């Protein structure tokens, strides 16, 4: 219905060189979360 | 030797923000090289104008509200971050806005300036919901390139700022999407040629031909070091 | 080397193994089959082009 | 305000978690035929 | 700092900045004669109070968005708490 | 409108055919320059190369001769690796004549005036019998890049003379080209690039001249838009 491939895989190109990747790559949308483990609160150092 | 040099041929203009360009004479293999180089340069180094500072009457910090305004100060700053402005003749200008009554506050309400053009007048900034509500802003617009976070501009400073001046992250680049394609040319003398078609997506404020020429100039200026004796 | 058994402790895994395995496979009717090359440099030059 | 940076933890809803390792320039990301790039690249090795 | 010794609302602060000013009695002290002579030469006087202000901890930045002042019943309120209670009374007055 | 300028701080010169060049760059420009330079150096450099050969008594690549230990496939492989620079026309035919016992070198090819041989130590065949002999006609055209023999035999719609042997043509004087992008810093500007290029070429030219030729080709290709 959305005019999209039925396999869920498309062709991609390398941004740094423009060359095509040799095999199709699964591309889509997934829901991502940011957890309460921040490196701002975990980095620590002590001299004296 | 037998190198048919490219030349800008046709520039279609699909919309105010969508355009296509073509370079017809290309030897075998040059199309992809120039397409990739131009795509990277266009996506990386185009100049533009963006909002960097906002001052609102009776507002001390961005984590606050205003009576008669449906949006928070943070949402207003985010809306102002997406304002497209074209400035000619100077690298810094200060705009002013004043509005009253019940209704939306769009980019058309900004006070007219001689050498400042607003590309999209329908860009909604905020909404007023009270008959006695009023707003007044002083918006500072600069020119630059790249992405400069405000948390980095605070570091590069030697004089204090007064309370009430709100900093905004600047996204100077006016180009969102770049796509290029290589197709065979129609030169009857040489049937081994091809043409390069470049598709551009912008927010206005930039001419496609000028962008292409600036990218080519940057690439040539970079190659000047390789060309020389060392 | 591992101090418990003497075997090497640094072993490639995951992406490196997959990359080398895909590098060193063969196909029956791949493009460019049948040529005779002067050396590995010519093979790399042929592949990159 | 805290912005994301290498060392922060991200995760999905299927038990897949990871640490951000690099912020990539937009022109270095893989892109499709129409030129729109991808936002996040994940290792397919984890799934099987 | 304001006239009451409290940082303004909306100020941008970093590590080491003073938020609330406070002084404490210090009492007797012992000083070596050389340092005392240096102090006398420089002309600065001796004080009976010691700085005990509340400072921003190192590695912490941010913007001041709220200040709360609590006072004892016997003690009389200062100006800034008066402003806060006027704001609260204004909100209640509009609601009614 | 102002960008950082590179400078060839180091040019490590290893041999007459191998060198390393480093440039110490704006963020993302190292790949942009390196990929373009590599593509131009590979698929666009012009030169002269052996393209075909005629051997008496040899009908096709499966045939077998006598008196030489190397098979004709080895002879074609050695011929493909011969580097020749020509000052003059676009097509020269060379002759080779050697009889007896010993290794026939490139110097045994008749000195055909303008045509020059850069490596007279190249080996073409080995002579094992006094009675047998080899006579061949080697032709050298001019062109750019690399052209496989498969597309040429597919492009030979006209009649092929009997005994015609096609050898792959390596016009470009490049053997191996590779580039690497590293990190560089100046006065706390961290997100900067340092480009390193590894270059290998046959004795026709020096690596620096090839790099300059590629850069000049690209710059002249871009001359129609630079304002």
Swiss-Prot record, chain A:
Q: How is it modified after translation?
A: Acetylated on several lysine residues in the presence of glucose.
Looking at the record's lineage, which domain of life comes first? Bacteria
Q: To what use is this protein put?
A: Co-administration of salinamide and rifampicin or salinamide and myxopyronin suppresses the emergence of resistance to both antibiotics.
Reported function: DNA-dependent RNA polymerase (RNAP) catalyzes the transcription of DNA into RNA using the four ribonucleoside triphosphates as substrates. Resistance to the antibiotics salinamide A, salinamide B, rifampicin, streptolydigin, CBR703, myxopyronin, and lipiarmycin can result from mutations in this protein.
Q: How does it assemble?
A: The RNAP catalytic core consists of 2 alpha, 1 beta, 1 beta' and 1 omega subunit. When a sigma factor is associated with the core the holoenzyme is formed, which can initiate transcription. The rRNA transcription and antitermination complex (rrnTAC) consists of RNAP, NusA, NusB, NusE (rpsJ), NusG, SubB, ribosomal protein S4, DNA and precursor rRNA; S4 is more flexible than other subunits. In pull-down experiments interacts with CedA.
Return the similarity comment: Belongs to the RNA polymerase beta chain family.
Q: What is this protein called?
A: DNA-directed RNA polymerase subunit beta
> What gene is behind this protein?
rpoB
The full protein's residues present here are: 1201 to 1248 of 1342
Swiss-Prot record, chain B:
Instruction: Spell out the post-translational modification annotation for this entry.
Output: (Microbial infection) ADP-ribosylated on both alpha subunits by the phage T4 protein ModA. ADP-ribosylated on only one of the alpha subunits by the phage T4 protein Alt.
Has the keyword Transcription been applied to this entry? yes
Query: What EC identifiers does the entry list?
Result: 2.7.7.6
Region feature Alpha N-terminal domain (alpha-NTD), mapped onto this chain = 1-230
At the top level, the lineage of the source is: Bacteria
Q: Which GO terms describe its biological process?
A: bacterial-type flagellum assembly; bacterial-type flagellum-dependent cell motility; cell motility; cellular response to cell envelope stress; DNA-templated transcription initiation; intracellular iron ion homeostasis; nitrate assimilation; regulation of DNA-templated transcription elongation
Where do the segments described as Required for interaction with Crp at class II promoters lie?
157-160
Keywords from the UniProt entry? Acetylation, ADP-ribosylation, DNA-directed RNA polymerase, Nucleotidyltransferase, Transcription, Transferase
GO cellular component terms listed in the entry, alphabetical order: cytoplasm; cytosol; cytosolic DNA-directed RNA polymerase complex; membrane; transcription elongation factor complex
Broad EC category: transferase
Mind listing the GO molecular function terms for this protein?
DNA binding; DNA-directed RNA polymerase activity; protein dimerization activity
The Swiss-Prot or TrEMBL note on domains reads: The N-terminal domain is essential for RNAP assembly and basal transcription, whereas the C-terminal domain is involved in interaction with transcriptional regulators (such as CRP) and with upstream promoter elements.
Membership in a protein family = Belongs to the RNA polymerase alpha chain family.
Protein name in UniProt: DNA-directed RNA polymerase subunit alpha
Q: Which organism is it from?
A: Escherichia coli (strain K12)
UniProtKB/Swiss-Prot annotation, chain C:
Q: Which domain of life is it from?
A: Bacteria
User: What does the UniProt record tell us about how this protein is modified after translation?
Assistant: Acetylated on several lysine residues in the presence of glucose.
Q: What is the effect of changing residue 14 to P?
A: Resistant to antibiotics salinamide A and B
Used in biotech as follows: Co-administration of salinamide and rifampicin or salinamide and myxopyronin suppresses the emergence of resistance to both antibiotics.
- Sum up the protein's function in the record's words: DNA-dependent RNA polymerase (RNAP) catalyzes the transcription of DNA into RNA using the four ribonucleoside triphosphates as substrates.
Q: Which family does it belong to?
A: Belongs to the RNA polymerase beta' chain family.
Can you state the subunit structure given in the record? The RNAP catalytic core consists of 2 alpha, 1 beta, 1 beta' and 1 omega subunit. When a sigma factor is associated with the core the holoenzyme is formed, which can initiate transcription. The rRNA transcription and antitermination complex (rrnTAC) consists of RNAP, NusA, NusB, NusE (rpsJ), NusG, SubB, ribosomal protein S4, DNA and precursor rRNA; S4 is more flexible than other subunits.
What is the name attached to this protein's record?
DNA-directed RNA polymerase subunit beta'
Q: Which organism is it from?
A: Escherichia coli (strain K12)
Q: Which region of the full protein is contained in this chain?
A: 491 to 539 of 1407
UniProtKB/Swiss-Prot annotation, chain F:
The species this protein belongs to is Escherichia coli (strain K12)
Q: Which residues of the full protein are shown?
A: 6 to 233 of 329
- Protein family: Belongs to the RNA polymerase alpha chain family.
Catalyzed reactions per annotation? RNA(n) + a ribonucleoside 5'-triphosphate = RNA(n+1) + diphosphate
Name it: DNA-directed RNA polymerase subunit alpha
* Record function comment: DNA-dependent RNA polymerase (RNAP) catalyzes the transcription of DNA into RNA using the four ribonucleoside triphosphates as substrates. This subunit plays an important role in subunit assembly since its dimerization is the first step in the sequential assembly of subunits to form the holoenzyme. Part of the processive rRNA transcription and antitermination complex (rrnTAC). The complex forms an RNA-chaperone ring around the RNA exit tunnel of RNAP. It supports rapid transcription and antitermination of rRNA operons, cotranscriptional rRNA folding, and annealing of distal rRNA regions to allow correct ribosome biogenesis.
Which gene underlies this protein?
A: rpoA
Q: Which domain of life is it from?
A: Bacteria
Instruction: Provide a GO biological process annotation.
Output: nitrate assimilation
Required for interaction with Crp at class II promoters: annotated span: 156-159
Q: What is the lineage of its organism?
A: Bacteria, Pseudomonadati, Pseudomonadota, Gammaproteobacteria, Enterobacterales
PTM field: (Microbial infection) ADP-ribosylated on both alpha subunits by the phage T4 protein ModA. ADP-ribosylated on only one of the alpha subunits by the phage T4 protein Alt.
List every stretch annotated Alpha N-terminal domain (alpha-NTD).
1-227
Question: Nucleotidyltransferase as a keyword?
Answer: yes
What keywords sit in the KW lines? Acetylation, ADP-ribosylation, DNA-directed RNA polymerase, Nucleotidyltransferase, Transcription, Transferase
Which Enzyme Commission number(s) are listed? Answer: 2.7.7.6
